[PDB]
Amino acid sequence: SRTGHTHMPSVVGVLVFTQFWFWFPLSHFLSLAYTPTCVIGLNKDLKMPKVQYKSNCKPSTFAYPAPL
């Protein structure tokens, strides 16, 4: 997890995905190993307000791959 705790869904998903050599349908278990790389700000009302996060780095070391 983000705090260092082992992510049980993620480890289970990776193991079962690795167990696709014997059964392709289990190859989808890797979905459990997908974690959104999101930082989401919530205020007291538990609704997402329009905030502007500020990262001090070049806009090419973390940008989406360009369409080719």
Partner 1 sequence: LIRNNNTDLMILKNTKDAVRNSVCHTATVIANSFMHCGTTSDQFLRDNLEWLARATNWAKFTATASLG
Partner 2 sequence: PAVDTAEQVYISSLALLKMLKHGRAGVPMEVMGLMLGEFVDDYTVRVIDVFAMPQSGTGVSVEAVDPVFQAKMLDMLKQTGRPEMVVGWYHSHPGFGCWLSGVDINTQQSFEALSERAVAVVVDPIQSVKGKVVIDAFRLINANMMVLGHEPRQTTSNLGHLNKPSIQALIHGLNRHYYSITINYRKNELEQKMLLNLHKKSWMEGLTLQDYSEHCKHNESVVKEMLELAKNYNKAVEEEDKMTQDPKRHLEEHVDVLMTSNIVQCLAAMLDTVVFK
Which residue in 21, 22, 24, 62 binds partner 1 (CB under 8 A)? 24
- Is there binding between residue 22 and partner 1 (CB under 8 A)? no
CB atoms inside a 10 Å sphere around CB 9 = 13
Q: Which is nearer to partner 2, 21 or 64 (CB)?
A: 21
Contact 6, 12 (CB under 8 A): no
Q: How far is the CB of 22 from partner 2 (least distance, A)?
A: 5
Tell whether residue 23 is a contact of partner 2 (CB under 8 A).
yes
Q: How far is residue 15's CA from residue 36's CA, in Å, rounded to a whole number?
A: 19
